[PDB]
Structure 1
Amino acid sequence: KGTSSFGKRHNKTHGLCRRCGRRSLHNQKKVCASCGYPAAKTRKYNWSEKAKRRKVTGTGRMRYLSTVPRRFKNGFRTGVPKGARG
């Protein structure tokens, strides 16, 4: 054990995950140790509040949900303003 036995480390337990991007995909088990892939549920537990906030809604791009508040304010309308050209 020690320095002599540390030189035999040239393998990989984990690899890149397709759903979360972290290097936490067990190669032999084929399940992610962070997001629970390939299960439909995403891993999440209440005994760690820090972990939940690291991937909660609003920490990414929010491509679609960010424009909803503006659409609700106008009542979800359709059409063009009176005499617009087109």
Structure 2
Amino acid sequence: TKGTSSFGKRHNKTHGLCRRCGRRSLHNQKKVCASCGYPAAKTRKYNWSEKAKRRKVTGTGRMRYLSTVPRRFKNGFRTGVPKGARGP
């Protein structure tokens, strides 16, 4: 009875949702995320999984601040306004 009949007893949850990475990988008893390694300060990553690194690497999300840095570098991190511009 190790198959179909035993499968009817599966109604608990080993993992809940992790607050840091959003996956269903937060071990509910150890309180440690199996994916991102929360609540350790560093994010879990290993060199034996290039695929796992590329799934979460920089550029796979939104880049809310980092995507604007090359333009500011190109204009030299200047401040102020164009001359004669309307405003205060």
1:6 Cα deviation from its structure 2 partner: 1.1
Tell me, in whole angstroms, the C-alpha distance in 2 between the residues paired with 1:74 and 1:3: 66
1:80 Cα deviation from its structure 2 partner: 1.1
1:74 Cα deviation from its structure 2 partner: 1.0
Tell me, in whole angstroms, the C-alpha distance in 2 between the residues paired with 1:83 and 1:2: 78
Render the CA deviation track for 1:9-39: whole Å, top value 9, x for unaligned.
Answer: 1111000000000000101100000000000
Tell me, in whole angstroms, the C-alpha distance in 1 between the residues paired with 2:7 and 2:83: 75
Aligned residues between the structures: 86
1:44 Cα deviation from its structure 2 partner: 0.4
Q: TM-score, structure 1 length as denominator? A: 0.96
Runs of at least 4 residues of structure 1 off by over 4 A?
none
* Corresponding residue of 1:11: 12
Which runs of no fewer than 5 residues in structure 1 stay unpaired? none
Tell me, in whole angstroms, the C-alpha distance in 1 between the residues paired with 2:62 and 2:23: 18
Give 3-state SS (helix, strand or coil) of 2:56's partner: coil
Tell me, in whole angstroms, the C-alpha distance in 1 between the residues paired with 2:3 and 2:79: 70
Aligned-pair identity in percent equals 100
Give 3-state SS (helix, strand or coil) of 2:5's partner: helix
